[PDB]
Design a protein around this ligand. Structure first.
Ligand code: NAG
Ligand code: CA
Length: 438
């Protein structure tokens, strides 16, 4: 599927090892650093749980055979063999067919930069001897040559992407994964760790929409990558959202400033993928346990500028910290669709799905409150947190008619635009508000 096809989607990011199994067990996993037993069949069994929340795309773990302990898929050995932990060809195709029957997209995570660590040599690996990898070195994160030539985590064999045989093989691998399985898009791992010009050829080989992971918070660093890939993961907005909602070290001017910095660094901000947590960073609720702040952040993710990504287990209030504690098994929850955050996400996705897709950011930039439009809906965020009944007030002159009746989808709140265009109302429990006009 194309960039334009993906612009309207909202992605549920899951770890294949951690989402679901064929069995109905709610037992915890005793070691989150090794395989817990999640499978493709486990995702198929629970697709209705995911679509029930209003997601219409999933991003799954990399699929190839991995080195020991590579439950996350990022440590490939033989790129042309499936990881048998997750299932076989038939089970992966049955998942993609089940998703497609539900009009859901499937996005494959892909690695070109590295293989899994060695304990001996490279027997069994697609890149089957030391000469096919860059010499081992540690990354100097001030030196882009070091970032590209040296080994991730000091330990992941860095494929020699300047060997043209290796480039042709990497392009063949991603063309085959996408073509053989009819994936609709890819999420590209470790983009900053290979020279930019590689990515043109690799994404063309894949032949579908790609969102690249450039793990850096600076728009001036990430933005230039959109010359080479059609979308990047919005790490710069992730840091702004965390400043406003998790530490409250900035007011909402930080989100307004970051929208402007992204407009100045990126060709097309509308296709960047928005998120507030993921598998590489502590969950939101680890640092900031206030679920009203989480709900405000999730509202930004789902309705603000960009393509939303929500990390699995957000809807069950998961609160684990540093990797792998943030990679909890979902089945302890028994896929409870009555969970407050599941019903919240379903509510917000119903706005997303069914409103015009025109987003107008920065209707109001306050210190502790903020408003924007998502289609016809007026979205109001705040960082006062749980228990707040603070007043929020701002002008909507020329955006909503004077005297217009606004009704909040989240809480009971009804408010009338004043005779001169001002919206003024009290929060309920610090919750986001999503107003429509009568
Ligand atoms: C794609 O399928 C072809 C036909 O079996 C096979 O030769 C190729 O290895 C497959 N590619 C991958 C990356 O699985
Ligand atoms: Ca590299």
């Amino acid at each position: 599927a194309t960039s334009d096809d993906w612009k309207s989607k909202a992605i549920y990011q899951l770890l294949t090892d951690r989402f679901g199994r064929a069995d109905d067990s709610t037992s915890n996993c005793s070691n989150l650093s090794n395989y817990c037993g999640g499978t493709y069949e486990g995702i198929t069994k629970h697709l209705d749980y995911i679509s029930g929340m209003g997601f219409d795309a999933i991003w799954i773990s990399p699929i190839p055979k991995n080195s020991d302990g590579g439950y996350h898929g990022y440590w490939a050995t033989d790129f042309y063999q499936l990881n048998s932990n997750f299932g076989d060809e038939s089970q992966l195709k049955a998942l993609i067919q089940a998703a497609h029957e539900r009009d859901m997209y499937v996005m494959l995570d892909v690695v070109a930069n590295h293989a899994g660590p060695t304990s001996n040599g490279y027997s069994g690996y697609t890149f089957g001897d030391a000469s096919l990898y860059h010499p081992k070195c540690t990354i100097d994160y001030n030196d882009q040559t070091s970032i590209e030539q040296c080994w991730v985590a000091d330990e992941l064999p860095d494929i020699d992407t300047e060997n043209s045989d290796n480039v042709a093989i990497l392009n063949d691998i991603v063309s085959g994964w996408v073509g053989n399985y009819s994936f609709d898009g890819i999420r590209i791992d470790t983009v900053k760790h290979i020279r930019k010009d590689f990515w043109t050829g690799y994404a063309e080989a894949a032949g579908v929409f790609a969102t690249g992971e450039v793990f850096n918070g600076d728009p001036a660093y990430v933005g230039p990558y959109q010359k080479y890939l059609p979308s990047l993961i919005n790490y710069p907005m992730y840091y702004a959202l965390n400043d406003v909602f998790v530490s409250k070290s900035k007011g909402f001017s930080r989100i307004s400033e970051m929208l402007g910095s992204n407009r100045n660094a990126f060709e097309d901000t509308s296709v960047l993928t928005t998120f507030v947590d993921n598998h590489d960073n502590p969950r939101f609720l680890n640092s900031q346990s206030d679920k009203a702040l989480f709900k405000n952040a999730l509202t930004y993710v789902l309705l603000g500028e960009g393509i939303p990504i929500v990390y699995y287990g957000s809807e069950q209030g998961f609160s684990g910290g540093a990797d792998p504690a943030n990679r909890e098994v979902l089945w302890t929850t028994n896929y409870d669709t009555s969970s407050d955050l599941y019903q919240f996400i379903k509510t917000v996705n119903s706005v997303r799905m069914k409103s015009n897709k025109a987003v107008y950011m920065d209707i109001y930039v306050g210190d502790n409150a903020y408003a924007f439009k998502h289609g016809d809906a007026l979205v109001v965020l705040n960082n006062y947190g749980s228990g707040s009944t603070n007043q929020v007030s701002f002008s909507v002159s020329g955006k909503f008619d004077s005297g217009a009746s606004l009704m909040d989808i989240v809480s009971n709140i009804t408010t009338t635009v004043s005779s001169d265009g001002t919206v003024t109302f009290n929060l309920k429990d610090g919750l986001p508000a999503i107003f429509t006009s009568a």
